[PDB]
């Protein structure tokens, strides 16, 4: 058994090594694919970021001073790493580190709190007040003098504020960068420089395709109109800012805020009150503007006082201090004197009062001029949403539109606010997040904190407006007890890494690893099915191998070659840095499991098929289709049950995907795939794991293998035996010969007995019906008998079947040769398989190689051997194993006679004790070879004996053959013959030949001897030329045992051709399954799938409204922080936040959304924690810097997506409550919130992160009550009074504006910055969380300030977001995606529609690869009419298919194509595309030569061409650049017209574009009436496509239309024929050749050389040929297939070179290789070829019936011609040849594979045709056929006719003498006869001698002497039986072939 595995393994390895080209691709293809994967890896670096804590962003309810800071210092979202001061429990300022803050802190720390400074100031103020009324001090001032000194001393001014601020003071500072650098430090102190902003890399989200393609199209530039009714200065300013590429996005994003408007619809007095109370910030800013403007007037008064007042007298007195008060000046002077000089001014020098006053003047005038044209009256009224939107578009096109507030509940007469007030905010969609989706689809592992594209509710202007409106509503409904502000504070985020690869390596790795093995699968299945197509599997099984061994060895071979590639690929992956952290061994095992599943899938796939090419073409596609469902099941894994998963894992490719998902997800989180963490579901309770996936793949492999084995063993091909679904006429036998196979008493339901002998080559003869096949089956081990015994040398079949199989060779009818194996390896392998050892096999192989004659091709491929040598090798390998019994089956079936003789020589050399048993159909072979023939018929063994015994037992008399030169008269021949022997019958007379018959009973020897003496002496006197005697041929014995109608021509004949071709095509297509499937099904299903995947995207209108509450995010955790519990208002605020109404609005008393009901709650439980954590926290005293165990980030070589980090992080869990709103609420009161969030978020997301699709983080925000922003201890009244008194002293009166601005100062001061605010933590990874929790906070603020007489469970504020309608550009940008999906649909449609003509080309190739096309061309059909009729049929069929596809399109009701104004365009496009694509692929039928290879190439080419020609032009049209894009696209668009597919692709795409544009203009409301057939849009495609189709057809017709030496010496007959042709050329010679000569190009050796013969009517000029002489060539160019080089071949006078149609109508071909359509019925072929031949229609039945009757075959007449066998096929071809009674009828091997009693019938018909008077021309290898039916043979050796003449004359001159065989009575009696022949006949070779019978070969023409001697000495020689014969014709041809070499 193991020997079988070893042999098959060695053979498979040898074959794989021999192929040598599949091997390289095998090893290279996956390496190239995964090198592409490596390059993808190396061009996608991973983004790693440090911990990220953010500052808080103030809101307009926190006063305009902090809010402004929070909109200038936080335009970048700094993201520091250390926590900001703003996240501390009770601190909100976040800016104690700016220069101003520190300086002011110092200013308090030495001045306000100073013990004596306040007293000194009060004293100075009192003294100043006294002096003004009039109109023991000084020591206090000196005491203050040191205090200001160290106020200067503190290092907030020595360096800071005096090394930074003066930097801009020298000259003009740079405008943009370092001014912001200094101002940021001057206003907000921020550590670590400024911090690094996080970026956003989710381009594919938000559906912003500009970023990926890199398109610099921002937005249309806003319309400019000079007159805004505003000062020209800032009209010029807008001119400047709207032009430069610098500061163009910033101004476009900031103009709405500073200058835009706010439009509110209801206009009711209540809305007016709401938006008057929501107006505070604008009053504040406008008050600041008034103050700045009033300084403009107050200033000149200050200057006038400073130079013109009593202060001049005071300054003069101070200058007089050296004359008055020098002591006081010197006590503390010169610096004061310098200030006094400045007071004096009139000084060129700098650093004086003039300079500081001038700089203050300049800066304040500049600030006033800049501020003077803001817009602080933003509120405009309207009446309904319609006018609001109509004005909103008009404003927005100018880019002055902030937002629009709409109250959906109050009519224009409303006066009292309802409890549940509701409003909506409408804005442009470039300013608000989209309102249809609430979460990013694929979870990026970032914080989503990039200020430009993540935050858009903040810089856009949503949150500010919402805060203003909600504080307005709050202050309107309730009183003003105390105001509290709102700070938004983004939640912190842990330290992440963003690996952009993992998305790619998720989906791509499966499909790449499947494409890696789409070639190996095809090769393996092709090999497996090819081994079974050529019947070698049956041969192997017969010799003894089991069925399991074949499967096991196929598996081992494939597994070895695949394992090599898997090892290479795994090393390549691991050391190419695609996977970073993974045990390579487990990855290798995973790949091996997939390979095993794939190999067993190949085993199963090979079971369905039976062809070779078809399997190789289709198996890879089947493999890919099997993989395909994993793509569908990849976006639905969040709803897919584990039970479903395991069930849908039955496909190995699908299982691969489910494993690589865990591969990538384990590689991403850092640990990677290792042994310990395998088989464990990474997510929580998936129950699906890697190890179980591998086990499922192994189970898949086992199931595939068992199913394949059962299916094959139950459904074998045409060759195996399917299993049930369940599973005196006999020569005396002289005792000398030892019996070899003594089968006796055999029965089967044959009833016979016969004993084959030791050495003699017994021939077995029969009709194949009554035996000779079943008997050979029982004799071998193939099949067991019933009630019989077959004794093979003493080992009965039933009893022993091991030794019998060991010692009985067998050669089947077909040869048994592996490809790619040399003869030596074949012979060694076949010797070993029988059972010898290795060395014995080598010795036997060498010896029998020497005995065979193939030793010179010792190492030559078994494909390069010629057919004769292949058959000889097969017969030789039937002799291996030293088999003492051999059973051939038709040796030398179709080999040329020389190889036939060679195989006979082999058989003679190996008959020494072998008991050969040949079963043959030929009769000469069974006679010249067999030593005893045994015939069986009816099941009876009729006779069996020596061929001499049969020829002399019931054999007819010896016939007589005579030939003349016409020139011999008949009467005298018969006269003399009958006079010598009066019992002679002239049995047959043919031209130039005469055949008699003479009996052998009363043999009358003297008369015979006289007859031959007379015919030899007087040979030439009569008309004779030669004569001979033939003994009864064995074929006769074996058989005995068991004029033309008128033809149409002209124009009716062409109509006959058209009708006949059309009917033939239709009748073939109507009865075929596969054409209909590839013609009606596949296009329909592909179009249907494309359309079904088209409508999956619903049409989009305008963005829907979406109310704003947190519970749109599902189930979540939200916390709070009760801080600063002293204040009663905050206590009741906390109570309202917790218990009374709930968190937001869900449990409102009256009602709320009906989809969100709320129930009861839980009484404030606390989670239970393991004692580990309690002991951990008790054992170590954690400081306040770190309260919880710090947990580790992603270090090097351990990069983790989120930091896995130990238990106990974040501290003990806080008490919880499942609130009424059904949202678990925690309570972080005395507990770091930032630290807790940071070290709790990882585990929280890990517990909820499966598939990373629409993931739900369990916490989205919370509200932290309490935060105290310190405020200055200055009241408004004191400040204004101080300024008023100061102005009173310095003679300052102001005026109107200084009074209108300095009158409302207390409210201005009170609204500046607020106090006791609250924080709103918000997780921004949910898009609408910020505004939602802002709304919740304001609801709480409202509900906490009620007057306690009204229940707080019914008051609330509800915000709704819904954007305006989209304009031109946004609508176009949306419609681009629909255009893209329609383009994909168009590509799929062209692919589906191109599936149709590929079948047409398939049929064309299948018909051309036979001779069917050429045979029709011979019958008389022009090329042009052939192609025209085929084109008409193809057009009609494609019209049917396109009508079906149009119907499918209509079914879907697609408005784009099926509109009544668009349907004609679709119909025309489809029909014309067929019209233009069919002629394009007509020429492709000439290139290929095998269906299932042309189809793949045509489909792939069509798909690729369409994809490129559509996608390239569409994408390039999407662009706008003109360099390398626009002109190149235009020139490319013109070139790509040459492809028909491009044309219809753009047709469909342009129809979609026109429909989209019309849809847009209908939505806004216009009319766009572009009809599709407009030349620019569609109509160039139709014109160009039609012209292209017309050009293609002409090109196809053109391609079909296109692509001396002196006479050497010869014998007498060839030269005589030459002269009979050249001179006195005959008139009646039907076919006359004239120096026909053809030389192959590039060989300089003539294939033929100057043939010259003519054939008379009634002369079967059989034309033989030595192998390679080119008889095929002379036929191929006599018909017309191959062009002629010289000479001319006239037929019935018509030449062949010039006019050929008459020749074709005057001849009838019969190709060697049968050419018939496998679907048309038997009678239909005759119908067809009769119609082409032109016999009229009314009598077609008569001719068809004559032809069907003449050839038998009448019972197979009406049946599909593919169901016939070889004999019936040849009969049909012959009947086709004789269809119209043509004068010349040119056959070529008429009878191959036919059995006697049928071959005779075909020969008879031919003989009758010959006798009618019409010539024929034969060509064959079976020389018995020629000798039977031809009358003028001619042998052609090397391009020339070696010999010509009648059969008898040829075998006279060329042939040797008569062969006389005779037997004596015993074996000793035979010796004496011999020397008698040695005496009288000196020339005597004994050809063969055997026991009791010796056959002399005497080369003596004078046979009369042999006759008279052998009948005078009949007694004395003891001669009982004898026979005289003559050297047959084959001997002559073998002599020729032998002398050739």
Ligand X SMILES: *[C@@H]1O[C@H](CO)[C@@H](O)[C@H](O)[C@H]1NC(C)=O
Which positions make up the binding site?
200, 202, 441, 507, 769, 772-774, 813, 857, 867-868, 921, 1667-1668, 1671-1673, 1766
Count the neighbouring beta carbons within 10 Å of the beta carbon of residue 692: 20
The residue among 86 and 771 lying less far from ligand X, judged by its C-beta, is 86
The residue among 53 and 261 lying less far from ligand X, judged by its C-beta, is 53
* Separation CA 1669–CA 1674 (nearest Å): 10
Which string of x and - marks every residue 560-599 that binds ligand CLR (by CB under 6 A)?
Answer: ----------------------------------------
- Residues 492, 1238: contact at Cβ < 8 Å? yes
Based on the shown chain and the rule CB under 6 A, indicate whether residue 1062 belongs to the binding site for ligand CLR: yes
Give 3-state DSSP helix, strand, coil % of the chain, rounded to 5. Answer: 50, 10, 40
Q: Which of 706, 1500, 1570, 1615 binds ligand CLR (CB under 6 A)?
A: 1500
Q: Which residues of the chain come before a gap where C and the next N are over 2.5 Å apart?
A: 135, 332, 727, 749, 965, 1042, 1603, 1865
Count the neighbouring beta carbons within 10 Å of the beta carbon of residue 283: 16
Contact partner at residue 617 from ligand CLR, ligand X, none, CB < 5 to 8 Å by partner kind: ligand CLR
Contact partner at residue 1901 from ligand X, ligand CLR, none, CB < 5 to 8 Å by partner kind: none
Query: How far apart are CB 101 and ligand X at their closest, in Å?
Result: 8
Query: How far apart are CB 1669 and ligand CLR at their closest, in Å?
Result: 36
User: Which 3 state secondary structure label does DSSP give 1379?
Assistant: helix
Contact partner at residue 85 from ligand CLR, ligand X, none, CB < 5 to 8 Å by partner kind: ligand X
Q: Would you list which residues are annotated within the binding site for ATP? A: 769, 772, 774, 813, 857, 867-868, 921, 1667-1668, 1671-1673, 1766
The residue among 274 and 1720 lying less far from ligand CLR, judged by its C-beta, is 1720
**Residues near ligand X, by CB under 6 A:** 85, 91, 93, 96
Sequence length of the chain is: 1941
Task: Please give the structure tokens belonging to residue 1287.
Answer: 């102005």
Count the neighbouring beta carbons within 10 Å of the beta carbon of residue 713: 14
Starting at the edge strand found earlier in the chain, the sheet holding 486-490 runs 56-58, 486-490, 1318-1322, 1259-1264, 1117-1120, 1224-1225, 1217-1218
* Separation CA 405–CA 468 (nearest Å): 12
Tokens 């549940």 -> residue: 420
Based on the shown chain and the rule CB under 6 A, indicate whether residue 1492 belongs to the binding site for ligand CLR: yes
Contact partner at residue 938 from ligand X, ligand CLR, none, CB < 5 to 8 Å by partner kind: none
Query: How far apart are CB 1066 and ligand CLR at their closest, in Å?
Result: 3
* Separation CA 1905–CA 1008 (nearest Å): 11
Q: Which of 618, 916, 1329, 1744 binds ligand CLR (CB under 6 A)?
A: 618
The residue among 91 and 160 lying less far from ligand X, judged by its C-beta, is 91
The residue among 86 and 1189 lying less far from ligand X, judged by its C-beta, is 86
* Separation CA 59–CA 465 (nearest Å): 10
Query: How far apart are CB 1270 and ligand X at their closest, in Å?
Result: 7
Q: Which of 1479, 1491, 1572, 1711 binds ligand CLR (CB under 6 A)?
A: 1491
Based on the shown chain and the rule CB under 6 A, indicate whether residue 1070 belongs to the binding site for ligand CLR: yes
Residues within window 985-1014 making contact with ligand CLR, judged by CB under 6 A: none
Contact partner at residue 1073 from ligand X, ligand CLR, none, CB < 5 to 8 Å by partner kind: ligand CLR
Burial of 1279 (0-12, 13-18, 19+ CB in 10 A): middle
Which residues have CB under 8 Å from 925's CB, separation 6+?
892, 900, 904
Task: Please give the structure tokens belonging to residue 883.
Answer: 């088999």
Based on the shown chain and the rule CB under 6 A, indicate whether residue 514 belongs to the binding site for ligand CLR: no
Query: How far apart are CB 1731 and ligand CLR at their closest, in Å?
Result: 12
Q: Would you list which residues are annotated within the binding site for Mg(2+)? A: 200, 202, 773, 1672
Based on the shown chain and the rule CB under 6 A, indicate whether residue 1063 belongs to the binding site for ligand CLR: yes
Query: How far apart are CB 1181 and ligand X at their closest, in Å?
Result: 24
Which string of x and - marks every residue 1374-1403 that binds ligand CLR (by CB under 6 A)?
Answer: ----------------------------x-
Query: How far apart are CB 39 and ligand X at their closest, in Å?
Result: 52
Instruction: Return the closest-CA partner of residue 382 out of 461, 469, 268.
Output: 268
Contact partner at residue 96 from ligand CLR, ligand X, none, CB < 5 to 8 Å by partner kind: ligand X
Based on the shown chain and the rule CB under 6 A, indicate whether residue 1440 belongs to the binding site for ligand CLR: yes
* Separation CA 101–CA 107 (nearest Å): 10
The residue among 85 and 1276 lying less far from ligand X, judged by its C-beta, is 85
Residues in the interface with ligand CLR (CB under 6 A) total: 26
Contact partner at residue 1153 from ligand X, ligand CLR, none, CB < 5 to 8 Å by partner kind: none
* Cα separations in angstroms, 1480 against 1437, 1484, 1593: 17, 8, 7
Task: Please give the structure tokens belonging to residue 1656.
Answer: 């008379």
Task: Please give the structure tokens belonging to residue 1074.
Answer: 């596969």
* Separation CA 569–CA 590 (nearest Å): 12
Based on the shown chain and the rule CB under 6 A, indicate whether residue 1253 belongs to the binding site for ligand CLR: no
Based on the shown chain and the rule CB under 6 A, indicate whether residue 617 belongs to the binding site for ligand CLR: yes
Q: Please name every residue paired with 962 in a beta bridge, in sequence order, or none if there are none.
A: 994, 1027
Query: How far apart are CB 1385 and ligand CLR at their closest, in Å?
Result: 18
Instruction: Return the closest-CA partner of residue 837 out of 3, 1731, 184.
Output: 3
DSSP 8-state code for residue 176: S
The residue among 1401 and 1830 lying less far from ligand CLR, judged by its C-beta, is 1401
The residue among 1095 and 1436 lying less far from ligand CLR, judged by its C-beta, is 1436
- Residues 878, 908: contact at Cβ < 8 Å? no
Q: Which of 1000, 1499, 1667, 1892 binds ligand CLR (CB under 6 A)?
A: 1499
What is the DSSP secondary-structure string of 914-946?
Answer: --EEEE-S-SHHHHHT-SEEEEEETTEEEEEE-
* Separation CA 1512–CA 1508 (nearest Å): 6
The residue among 557 and 1407 lying less far from ligand CLR, judged by its C-beta, is 1407
Query: How far apart are CB 1395 and ligand CLR at their closest, in Å?
Result: 8
Q: Which residue spans within 1049-1116 are E strands per DSSP?
A: 1106-1107
Query: How far apart are CB 1129 and ligand X at their closest, in Å?
Result: 23
Through-space distance between the first and last CA atoms of the chain, rounded to whole angstroms:
47
Query: How far apart are CB 1267 and ligand X at their closest, in Å?
Result: 12
Query: How far apart are CB 1757 and ligand CLR at their closest, in Å?
Result: 19
Q: Which residue is nearest to ligand X (CB)?
A: 96
Residues within window 1721-1750 making contact with ligand CLR, judged by CB under 6 A: none
Tokens 């899938």 -> residue: 601
The residue among 1065 and 1849 lying less far from ligand CLR, judged by its C-beta, is 1065
Contacts 24+ apart (CB under 8 A), 1723-1728: 1723/1748, 1723/1757, 1723/1758, 1724/1064, 1724/1067, 1724/1761, 1725/1761, 1725/1772, 1725/1776, 1726/1775, 1726/1776, 1726/1779, 1728/1060, 1728/1063, 1728/1064
The residue among 533 and 882 lying less far from ligand CLR, judged by its C-beta, is 533
Degrees, nearest 5: CA angle 1506-1508-1512: 125
Residues within window 1153-1212 making contact with ligand CLR, judged by CB under 6 A: none
The residue among 88 and 1935 lying less far from ligand X, judged by its C-beta, is 88
Based on the shown chain and the rule CB under 6 A, indicate whether residue 622 belongs to the binding site for ligand CLR: no
Largest CA distance in the chain: 195
Helices and strands in the chain, H and E counts: 72, 42
Contact partner at residue 650 from ligand X, ligand CLR, none, CB < 5 to 8 Å by partner kind: none
Q: Which residue is nearest to ligand CLR (CB)?
A: 1076
Residues making contact with ligand CLR (CB under 6 A) = 614, 617-618, 621, 1062-1063, 1066, 1069-1070, 1073-1074, 1076, 1078-1080, 1402, 1436-1437, 1440, 1491-1492, 1495-1496, 1499-1500, 1503
């Amino acid at each position: 058994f193991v020997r079988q595995i070893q042999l098959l393994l060695w053979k498979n390895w040898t074959l794989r090594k021999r192929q040598k080209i599949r091997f390289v691709v095998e090893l290279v293809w996956p390496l190239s694919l995964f090198l592409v994967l490596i390059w993808l890896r190396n061009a996608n670096p991973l983004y790693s970021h440090h911990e990220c804590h953010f500052p808080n962003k103030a809101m307009p309810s926190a006063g305009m001073l902090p809010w402004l800071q929070g909109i200038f210092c936080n335009v970048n979202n700094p993201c520091f790493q250390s926590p900001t001061p703003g996240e501390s429990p009770g601190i909100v300022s976040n800016y104690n580190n700016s220069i101003l803050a520190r300086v002011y802190r110092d200013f308090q720390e030495l001045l306000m709190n100073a013990p004596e400074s306040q007293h000194l100031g009060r004293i100075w103020t009192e003294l100043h007040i006294l002096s003004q009324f009039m109109d023991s001090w000084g020591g206090i001032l000196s005491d203050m003098s040191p205090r200001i000194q160290e106020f200067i001393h503190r290092p907030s001014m020595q360096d800071l504020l005096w090394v930074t601020r003066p930097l801009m003071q020298n000259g003009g500072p740079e405008t943009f960068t370092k001014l912001m650098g200094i101002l940021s430090d001057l206003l907000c102190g921020y550590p670590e420089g400024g911090g690094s902003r996080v970026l956003s890399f989710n381009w594919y989200e938000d559906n912003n395709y500009k970023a990926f393609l890199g398109i610099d199209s921002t937005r249309k530039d806003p319309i400019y109109s000079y007159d805004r009714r505003t000062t020209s200065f800032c009209n010029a300013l807008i001119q400047s800012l709207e032009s430069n590429p610098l500061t163009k996005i910033a101004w476009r994003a900031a103009k709405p805020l500073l200058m835009g408007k706010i439009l509110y619809t209801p206009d009711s007095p209540a809305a007016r009150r709401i938006l008057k109370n929501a107006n505070s910030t604008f009053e504040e800013l406008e008050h600041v503007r008034k103050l700045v403007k009033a300084w403009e007037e107050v200033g000149p008064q200050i200057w006038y006082f400073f130079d013109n007042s009593t202060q001049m007298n005071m300054i003069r007195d101070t200058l007089g201090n050296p004359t008055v008060k020098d002591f006081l000046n010197r006590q503390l002077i010169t610096a004061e004197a310098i200030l006094n000089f400045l007071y004096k001014g009139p000084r060129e020098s700098q650093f004086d009062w003039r300079d500081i006053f001038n700089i203050t003047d300049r800066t304040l005038r500049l600030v006033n001029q800049y501020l003077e044209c803001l817009v602080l009256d933003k509120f405009e009224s309207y009446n309904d949403e319609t006018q609001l939107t109509q004005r909103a578009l008009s404003l927005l096109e100018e880019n002055m539109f902030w937002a629009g507030v709409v109250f959906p509940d109050m009519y224009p007469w409303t006066s009292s606010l309802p409890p549940h007030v509701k409003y909506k905010i409408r804005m442009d969609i470039d300013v608000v997040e989209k309102t249809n989706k609430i979460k990013d689809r694929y979870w990026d592992s970032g914080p989503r904190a990039d200020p430009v594209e993540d935050f858009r509710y903040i810089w856009g202007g949503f949150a500010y407006l919402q805060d203003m409106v909600e504080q307005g509503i709050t202050r309107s409904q309730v009183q003003a007890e105390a105001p509290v502000g709102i700070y938004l504070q983004q939640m912190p985020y842990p330290c992440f890494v963003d690996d952009s690869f993992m998305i790619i390596l998720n989906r791509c790795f499966p499909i790449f690893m499947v494409l890696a093995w789409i070639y190996s699968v095809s090769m393996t299945v092709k090999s497996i099915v090819l081994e079974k197509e050529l019947r070698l599997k049956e041969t192997l099984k017969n010799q003894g191998v089991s069925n399991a061994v074949i499967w096991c060895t196929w598996f081992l071979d494939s597994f070895s070659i695949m394992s090599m590639s898997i090892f290479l690929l795994t090393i390549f992956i691991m050391h190419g840095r695609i996977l970073h952290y993974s045990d390579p061994f487990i990855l290798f095992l995973f790949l091996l499991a997939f390979s095993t599943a794939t190999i067993m899938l190949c085993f199963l796939l090979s079971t369905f098929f039976s062809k070779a090419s078809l399997a190789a073409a289709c198996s890879g596609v089947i493999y890919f289709t099997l993989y395909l469902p994993h793509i569908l099941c990849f976006a639905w894994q969040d709803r897919m049950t584990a039970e479903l998963k395991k069930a849908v894992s039955l496909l190995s490719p699908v299982a691969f995907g489910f494993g690589t998902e865990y591969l990538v997800r384990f590689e991403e989180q850092g640990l990677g795939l290792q042994w310990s963490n395998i088989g464990n579901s990474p997510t929580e309770g998936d129950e699906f794991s890697f190890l179980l996936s591998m086990q499922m793949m192994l189970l898949d492999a086992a199931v595939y293998g068992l199913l394949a084995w059962y299916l094959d063993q139950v459904f074998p091909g045409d060759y195996g035996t399917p299993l049930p679904w369940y599973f005196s006429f006999f020569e005396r036998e002289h005792p000398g010969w030892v019996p070899g196979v003594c089968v006796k008493n055999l029965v089967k339901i044959d009833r016979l007995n016969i004993t084959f002998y030791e050495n003699q080559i017994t021939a077995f003869l029969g009709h194949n019906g009554a035996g000779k096949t079943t008997t050979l089956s029982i004799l071998t081990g193939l099949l067991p008998p019933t009630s019989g015994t077959v004794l093979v040398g003493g080992r009965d079949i039933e009893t022993s079947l091991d030794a019998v199989r060991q010692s009985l060779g067998m050669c089947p009818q077909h040869n048994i040769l592996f490809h790619h194996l040399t003869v030596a390896e074949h012979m060694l392998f076949y010797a070993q398989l029988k059972g010898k050892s290795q060395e014995e096999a080598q010795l036997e192989m060498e010896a029998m190689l020497e005995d065979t004659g193939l030793h010179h091709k010792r190492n030559e491929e078994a494909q390069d051997l010629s057919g004769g040598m292949q058959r000889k090798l097969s017969v030789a390998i039937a002799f291996v194993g030293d088999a003492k019994v051999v059973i051939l089956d038709e040796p030398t079936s179709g080999v040329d006679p020389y190889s036939r003789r060679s195989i006979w020589d082999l058989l003679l050399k190996y008959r020494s004790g072998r008991t050969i048993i040949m079963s043959t159909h030929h009769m000469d072979e069974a006679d010249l070879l067999g030593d005893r023939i045994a015939i069986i018929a009816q099941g009876r063994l009729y006779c069996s004996g020596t061929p001499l015994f049969l020829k002399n037992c019931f054999g007819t008399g010896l016939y007589l053959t005579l030939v003349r030169k016409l020139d011999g008269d008949v009467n005298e021949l018969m006269d003399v013959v009958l006079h010598h022997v009066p019992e002679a019958k002239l049995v047959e007379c043919i031209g130039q030949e005469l055949i008699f018959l003479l009996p052998n009973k009363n043999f009358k020897h003297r008369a015979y001897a006289s007859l031959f003496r007379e015919l030899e002496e007087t040979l030439a006197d009569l008309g004779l030329s030669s004569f001979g005697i033939s003994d009864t041929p064995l074929e006769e014995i074996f058989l005995k045992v068991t004029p033309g109608p008128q033809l149409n021509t002209g124009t009716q004949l062409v109509l006959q051709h058209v009708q006949a071709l059309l009917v033939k095509r239709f009748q073939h297509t109507i009865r075929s399954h596969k054409d209909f499937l590839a013609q009606i099904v596949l296009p329909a299903t592909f179009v249907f799938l494309a359309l079904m995947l088209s409508i999956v995207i619903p049409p989009f209108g305008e963005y829907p409204a979406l109310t704003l509450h947190p519970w749109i995010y599902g189930q979540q955790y939200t916390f709070f922080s009760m801080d600063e519990p002293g204040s009663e208002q905050f206590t009741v605020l906390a109570d309202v936040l917790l218990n009374k109404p709930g968190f937001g609005n869900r449990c409102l008393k009256e009602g709320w959304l009906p989809e969100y009901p709320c129930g009861n709650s839980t009484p404030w439980k606390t989670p239970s924690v393991s004692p580990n954590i309690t002991q951990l926290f008790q054992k170590q005293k954690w400081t306040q810097v770190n309260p919880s165990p710090s947990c580790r980030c992603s270090t090097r070589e351990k990069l983790t997506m989120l930091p896995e980090c130990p238990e106990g992080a974040g501290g003990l869990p806080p008490p919880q409550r499942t609130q009424r709103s059904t949202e678990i609420l925690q309570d972080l009161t005395d507990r770091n919130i930032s630290d807790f969030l940071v070290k709790t978020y990882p585990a929280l997301i890990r517990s909820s992160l499966k598939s990373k699709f629409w993931v739900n983080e369990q916490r989205y925000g919370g509200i932290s009550i309490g935060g105290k922003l310190p405020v200055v201890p200055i009241t408004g009244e004191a400040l204004v009074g101080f300024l008023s008194d100061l102005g009173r002293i310095m003679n300052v009166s102001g005026g109107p504006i200084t009074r209108e601005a300095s009158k409302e100062i207390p409210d201005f001061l009170k609204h500046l910055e607020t106090e006791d605010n609250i924080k709103v933590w918000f997780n921004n990874k949910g898009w609408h969380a910020l505004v939602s929790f802002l709304n919740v906070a304001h609801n709480a603020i409202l509900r906490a300030s009620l007057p306690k007489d009204r229940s707080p469970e019914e008051y609330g504020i509800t915000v709704i977001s819904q954007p305006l309608n989209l304009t031109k550009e946004q609508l176009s940008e949306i419609t681009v995606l629909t255009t893209s999906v329609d383009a994909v649909v168009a590509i799929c449609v062209i692919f589906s529609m191109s599936f149709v003509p590929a079948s047409f080309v398939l049929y064309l190739i299948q018909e051309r690869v036979n001779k069917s096309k050429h045979l029709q061309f011979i019958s008389g059909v022009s090329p042009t009419t052939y192609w025209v009729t085929n084109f008409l049929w193809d057009i009609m069929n494609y019209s049917v298919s396109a009508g079906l596809v149009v119907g499918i399109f209509i079914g879907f009701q697609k408005k784009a194509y099926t509109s009544p104004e668009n349907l004609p365009a679709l119909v025309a496009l489809l029909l014309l595309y067929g019209w233009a694509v069919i002629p394009m692929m007509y020429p492709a039928s000439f290139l290929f030569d095998v269906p299932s290879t042309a189809y793949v190439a045509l489909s792939c080419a069509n798909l690729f061409i369409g994809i490129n020609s559509s996608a390239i032009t569409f994408i390039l049209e999407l662009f706008e650049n003109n360099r390398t894009l626009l002109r190149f696209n235009a020139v490319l668009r013109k070139l790509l017209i040459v492809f028909p597919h491009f044309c219809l692709g753009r047709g469909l795409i342009d129809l979609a574009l026109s429909q989209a544009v019309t849809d847009v203009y209908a939505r806004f409301g216009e009319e766009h009436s572009a009809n599709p057939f407009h030349w620019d849009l569609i109509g160039k495609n139709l014109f160009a496509m039609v012209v292209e189709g017309v050009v293609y057809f002409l090109l196809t017709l053109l391609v079909q239309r296109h692509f001396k030496e002196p006479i050497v010496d010869e014998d007498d007959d060839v030269a005589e024929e030459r002269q009979r042709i050249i001179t006195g050329g005959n008139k009646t010679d039907i076919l006359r050749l004239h120096e026909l000569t053809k030389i192959y190009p590039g060989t300089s050796s003539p294939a033929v050389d100057r043939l010259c013969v003519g054939v008379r009517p009634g002369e079967c000029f059989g034309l033989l040929g030595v192998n390679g002489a080119g008889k095929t060539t002379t036929f191929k160019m006599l018909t017309g297939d191959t062009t002629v080089t010289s000479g001319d071949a006239t037929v019935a006078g018509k030449s062949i070179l010039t006019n050929i149609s008459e020749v074709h109508q005057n001849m009838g071909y019969c190709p060697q290789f049968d050419a018939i359509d496998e679907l048309l019925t038997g009678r239909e072929h005759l119908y067809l070829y009769a119609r082409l031949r032109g016999v009229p229609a009314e009598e077609i039945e008569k001719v068809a019936n004559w032809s069907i009757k003449s050839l038998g075959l009448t019972v197979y007449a009406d049946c599909l011609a593919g169901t016939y066998s070889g004999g019936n096929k040849r009969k049909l071809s012959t009947a086709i040849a004789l269809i119209g009674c043509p004068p010349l009828v040119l056959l070529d091997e008429p009878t191959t594979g036919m059995d006697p009693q049928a071959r005779r019938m075909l020969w008879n018909v031919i003989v009758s045709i010959i006798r009618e008077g019409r010539a024929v021309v034969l060509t064959s290898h079976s020389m018995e056929e020629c000798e039977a039916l031809c009358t003028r043979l001619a042998i052609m050796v090397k391009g020339a006719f070696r010999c010509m003449g009648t059969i008898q004359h040829l075998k006279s001159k060329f042939g040797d003498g008569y062969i006389v065989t005779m037997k004596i009575k015993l074996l000793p009696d035979l010796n004496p006869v011999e020397q008698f022949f040695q005496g009288n006949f000196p020339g005597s070779v004994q050809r063969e001698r055997h026991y009791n019978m010796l056959q002399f070969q005497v080369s003596s023409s004078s046979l009369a002497r042999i006759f008279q001697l052998l009948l005078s000495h009949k007694d004395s020689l003891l001669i009982e039986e004898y026979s005289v014969t003559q050297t047959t014709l084959d001997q002559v041809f073998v002599n020729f072939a032998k002398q050739q070499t």
